[PDB]
Structure formats: C-alpha cells, structure tokens
Design a protein. Sequence first.
Lengths: 15, 170
Amino acid sequence: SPEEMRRQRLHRFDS
Amino acid sequence: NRPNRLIVDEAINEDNSVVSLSQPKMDELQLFRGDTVLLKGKKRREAVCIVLSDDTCSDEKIRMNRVVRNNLRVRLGDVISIQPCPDVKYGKRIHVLPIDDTVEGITGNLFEVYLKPYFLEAYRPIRKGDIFLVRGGMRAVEFKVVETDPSPYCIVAPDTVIHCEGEPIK
C-alpha cells in the first residue's frame, strides 16, 4: 500500500 | 500539480533521500509528509526525494543535502522546481556500481556493508543516473544508479532486487 510506504518512510526519516 | 520554484537551502535532515519544506508551503502545494517528489535542477538533471515538513524552513526555500544538490547540479541559493510524483512504482530490480575513486583499496561485500543498511525498510525513491554517498564502517563510498526497472524512476521497496556486480565506474 502507499500508506505502508508512508509509515515506513516516516519511521526511518522523521523519528 | 505543476512544478513550483523554490530556493535551495542546506539540509537539516542530512539524508540523501529527504527534502524539507515549510508547513505553509507543503499546504499550498498539496503535499503530505512522506510523499515522493520530483526535483528538476540544471543541465537537464532530475532527482526524486521524500518530502518532509520543517518548522525552521523559510516558505520559499527547500532544504536538501549536498548529494541531492550535486545530482541536480545546483548550489545553495539556486532555484529548482518541485512537483508531486505519486505514480512512481516499486522497483523490480536496480543496478548500482561504486565510483572508482571512492572504493580504492576497499575490500569486502559492498552490498552487505553499504547498500543493504542504506536501503533497508526505507522505500527510497531513486532515478537512473543518481550518484549517492553511502557510509559503511567508517568509509564513505559513492554509488551510481546505472539502471532501474521500471526506468528511469522507481522506489526501492523491500522486494526490490538490488544488484551490485562488476567493475567500479569512472
């Protein structure tokens, strides 16, 4: 999903 | 929708995949934190990045690190354009190679020491022709994206096959 990608990106790059 | 011009500023999120905008500018541009965006710089160069909001960023500026600036052939204070890039697909396979003068005398497994932790669970967007700097151990090595499938843009997802094999390039 696009939203699982968004969750992982924010976890990795914005805390 | 359309590209928006912004002034290049220095990164506060020091990561090759991240650009920062002010929250008012993100609102104006209809962007959400974590969106993929397409940047256009000089000499026909492009970059794809992940946009985040930043409470220290001037409204008409965009923060990006030196790796992204070099890919775009721009300096601090130059103007680039940003636009949403929501249709980028997960990559089937990508092929990267180290740059010769950054791997001089380096032995070992470049995938395990550099690329695997760099891409791990990050969903980094990349473009064919990107040069990106990766630290592994205490050495920093530059890699070039020599091909992607699909091309020229893809997202390095957990299932994306990462190939690194062959001579360093110049």
